[PDB]
């Protein structure tokens, strides 16, 4: 069974089309997870800002200082979440390019089935990532609205 050279590529490229699809799956999941965690944190800070707004003028200086310090610590938590967010989105972009050009390699080998499977996986991860991007952006917009209401009531009082 002296294998030709074409069957070696047709079998070989399936390795990377499954492996960069594995990287694309783990980056996509972890990015979705980090987005969801950051979205939950943003919703929590949004709730804190609304509660702080609703409590304005009903607390003394010490309680205002305590709630402000909690908000500052939550801001630092957002900064760390945003840093891991940017690194995760960077690695997911790198994985997207990895699986795209890997499936291109599968196309040029004639092993089109592994290529199309990788392709469908790229579109699936792109839609899932963009979906949870939209959810994160909605949470950020709600946080901005809560902050604007907080500033308006603080200035009003």
């Amino acid at each position: 069974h002296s294998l030709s050279s074409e069957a070696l590529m047709r079998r070989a490229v399936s390795l990377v089309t499954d492996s960069t699809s594995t990287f694309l799956s783990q980056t996509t999941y972890a990015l979705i997870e980090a987005i969801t965690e950051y979205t939950k944190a943003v919703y929590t800070l949004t709730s804190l800002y609304r509660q702080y707004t609703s409590l304005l003028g009903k607390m003394n200086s010490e309680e205002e200082d305590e709630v402000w310090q909690v908000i500052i610590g939550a801001r630092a938590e957002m900064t760390s979440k945003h840093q891991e967010y940017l690194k995760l989105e960077t690695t997911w972009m790198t994985a997207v390019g990895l699986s795209e050009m890997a499936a291109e390699a599968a196309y040029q080998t004639g092993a089109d089935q592994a290529s199309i499977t990788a392709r469908n996986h790229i579109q699936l991860v792109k839609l899932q990532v963009e979906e949870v991007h939209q959810l994160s952006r909605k949470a950020e917009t709600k946080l901005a609205e809560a902050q604007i209401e907080e500033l308006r009531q603080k200035t009003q009082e």
Binding site: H1, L3, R11, L15, S25
Partner: protein, 68 residues
């Protein structure tokens, strides 16, 4: 003969390199097993299956090369 030898050496060089991948695969099965993150284990079992197919195909090529 030299060429066939080169790919024999290459398959031996990659089969242990995927055996180590199986080891890390089992490690990651254990690590995400304790924390019930439901959607993780599905894609991890898919990881296990894909690496199993890569493992089996390399063994079949390991056999077929020695046939030649």
């Amino acid at each position: 003969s030299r060429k066939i030898r080169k790919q024999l050496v290459h398959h031996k060089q990659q089969l242990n390199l995927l055996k180590a991948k199986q080891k890390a695969l089992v490690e990651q099965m254990e690590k995400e097993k304790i924390q019930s993150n439901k959607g993780s284990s599905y894609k991890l079992l898919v990881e296990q299956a894909k690496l199993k197919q890569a493992t089996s195909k390399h063994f079949k090529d390991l056999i077929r090369l020695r046939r030649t």
